[PDB]
Structure 1
Amino acid sequence: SGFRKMAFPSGKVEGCMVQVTCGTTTLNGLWLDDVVYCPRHVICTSEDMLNPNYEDLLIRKSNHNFLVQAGNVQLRVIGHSMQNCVLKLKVDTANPKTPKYKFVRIQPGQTFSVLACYNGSPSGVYQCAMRPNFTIKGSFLNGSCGSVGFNIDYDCVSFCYMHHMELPTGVHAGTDLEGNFYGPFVDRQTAQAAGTDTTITVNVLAWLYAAVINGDRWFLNRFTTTLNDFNLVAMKYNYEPLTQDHVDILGPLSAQTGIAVLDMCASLKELLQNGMNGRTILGSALLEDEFTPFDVVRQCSGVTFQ
């Protein structure tokens, strides 16, 4: 029993983290086989933050200008190139700790763990969601860029995020591992702001299922709803529309608890319209939306990784 914001074990990613330095600027890189991936704004100067000419800045760098360290060991750079907003530094040594891996582009509403790093060393690990507005609510300071987000499946690490930017109100933006930003953001110091965020309805439902599995059942009412009538209420409270695919993805939790998804929607409808009246669910006073249906099953069934 119990339900926690749970991150993936980070060891496989820890073995890939390195430090990349250009002049005064150090950030993190991801070392897979003989390539180090890092944000291209490592090549930025104190002056041209507002609109860096990245191609001109990279033209003027040589391999030797990139100082890459794995622990206390310098990795010699033998090639460099830029792919969208990431640099790829070819090094002369393949990373012997390289896990089985994939580069994936996740969808809004999906979750992943972040291994927050500084100077190529890990600070901590936490779970995040890709918000509907393509930000993440992370915890990042100066020097954290190049920290990555990831999922694990059996033995395979799917890298999905690399950290680049902090936006107004303290939320975060970054790229996939092909260097393409999530959302409309750019790697320059210019007026950007996130679009308004919305609540990830399918995740709130999954978390209500987790509550029922843990014996926290007070909010279940005796009613049902149609999918259309629920979505009319979701809309007023800034919740994402619930789709049939969402309903089908909730199948396993619905089957385990014996609660039809649309019956759970009726209970969520009542919570939205009426509030929680000072009560908590799974120890929370707000409805939580950063657990996917898959996260709930993994945590409540004890799925492991090798």
Structure 2
Amino acid sequence: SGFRKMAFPSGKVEGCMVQVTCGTTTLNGLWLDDVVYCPRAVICTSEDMLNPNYEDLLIRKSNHNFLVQAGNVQLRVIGHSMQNCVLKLKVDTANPKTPKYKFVRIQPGQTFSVLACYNGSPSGVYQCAMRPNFTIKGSFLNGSAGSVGFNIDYDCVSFCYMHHMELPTGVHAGTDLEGNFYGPFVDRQTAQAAGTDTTITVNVLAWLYAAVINGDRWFLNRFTTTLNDFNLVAMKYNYEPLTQDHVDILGPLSAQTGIAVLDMCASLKELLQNGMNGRTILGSALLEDEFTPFDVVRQCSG
């Protein structure tokens, strides 16, 4: 038992991380088969990063303008193209460490592991969630662009995030591995603001179930609520609305614990209305919303 913010083992991804330099700009790339993927920001002229014309900049590059290093080995780029906000560098060597993988675009509330890298080398691994406002609350410094987020529930590495940028509030924005940004953000240093963030209600409920599974019961109550009454309380606290799909997803946990979903919603309502009373749940004094129902089942699977 116990409950921790657990990331996936990062080895399968470490074996894919390279350094990409174009001109005076360096960031990380993801070397899968004979293609290195990285943010197209690497081709910016380190002067025009407000309104770069990436199509214009790329056609002026030669393959030999890109310096790709995998450890001591320099990889030869033999072609380059752009898919949305991601640059694809064809190299003459397939990565022998390429895992089984796929690219997946995730929904807000989904969680994933981040391998934070600098100059193609890993610094550390942590767990994140796609926020409702399509930012992620990462830990990234200059040079971290091209770090990726991933899941490995089985033997397949699901790449879902490539890091690009930090916003003024210190949260982060990036793309899927097809180069489409999450949210309305763009890979330009024009002023951009994240929308108001909200709490991922379905994840809070999953975590309350995780607490009951681990022996907590102090926050349970005799009350039940309707989905609409709960949703009226939730929006008053900047909580995401709960849908019937969420209720369905919470089914297995409600069955494993014997506590109906709307019975747990009433617990959440009381915690919101009356606070936590200086008490903790699973070692936290605030409600945690970056564990999904799937995360809870995986970590609490006997």
**Class of the TM-score when normalised by the shorter of the 2 chains:** over 0.9
Return the TM-score normalized by structure 1: 0.98
Partner Cα separation in structure 1 for residue 255 and residue 204 of structure 2? 17
Q: Deviations over 1:55-81 (max 9, x none)?
A: 111111100110001111011000000
**Counterpart Cα distance in 2 of 1:234 and 1:120:** 42
Shift of 1:175: 0.3
> 2:24, 2:119 → 1: CA distance?
12
Question: Contact conserved, 2:111 with 2:292, CA < 8 A, in 1?
Answer: yes
Cα deviations by residue, 1:257-301 (Å, 9 ceiling, x for unpaired): 110001000100000000001111011010000000000011111
Whole-angstrom CA distance in 1 between matches of 2:91 and 2:153:
28
Q: Percent identity?
A: 99
The whole-number CA distance in structure 1 between the counterparts of 2:138 and 2:153 is: 22
SS at match of 1:263: helix
**Structure 2: tracts of 5 or more residues without a match:** none
What is the CA–CA distance in structure 1 between the aligned matches of 2:55 and 2:89, rounded to whole Å? Answer: 15
Contact 2:25 2:46 in 1 (8 A): no
Q: Which residue of 1 aligns with 2:91?
A: 91
Looking at structure 1, the residues matched to 196 and 37 of structure 2 have their Cα atoms a distance apart, in angstroms, of 31
1:53 Cα deviation after fit: 1.5
Shift of 1:188: 0.6
Report the TM-score, using the length of structure 2 for normalisation: 0.99
Shift of 1:25: 1.1
Q: CA deviation at 1:159?
A: 0.4
Q: Per the alignment, in what secondary structure is the counterpart of residue 300 of structure 2?
A: helix
- How far apart, in 1, do the equivalents of 2:97 and 2:27 lie? 20
* CA shift for structure 1 position 252: 1.1
* 1:209-256 CA distance string (max 9 Å, x none): 000011121100111111111111111111111011101101111111
Report the 3-state secondary structure (helix = DSSP H, G, I; strand = E; otherwise coil) of the residue aligned with 2:152: strand
Structure 1's consecutive aligned runs of 4 or more residues displaced over 4 angstroms after TM superposition are: none
Question: Does residue 169 of structure 1 match 2:176?
Answer: no
Cα distance in 2 for residues equivalent to 1:137 and 1:72: 33
Q: CA deviation at 1:46?
A: 2.2
RMSD between aligned residues:
0.7
SS at match of 1:31: strand
Q: Which residue in 1 is equivalent to 2:70?
A: 70
Deviations 1:37-68 (A, max 9, x none): 00001011121011111111111110011000
> Aligned partners of 1:289 and 1:46: how far apart in 2?
38
* 1:164-195 Cα deviation digits (max 9, x unpaired): 01001100000000101000000111111011
Aligned length: 302
Tell whether the 8 Å contact from 2:106 to 2:160 is kept in structure 1 after alignment.
yes
**Which SS does the other structure have where 1:290 is aligned?**
coil
* Local SS of the residue matching 2:289: coil
What SS does the corresponding residue of 1:7 show, helix, strand or coil? coil
Q: Which runs of 5+ in 1 are unaligned?
A: none
Give me the whole-angstrom Cα distance separating, in 2, the residues matched to 1:174 and 1:113.
14
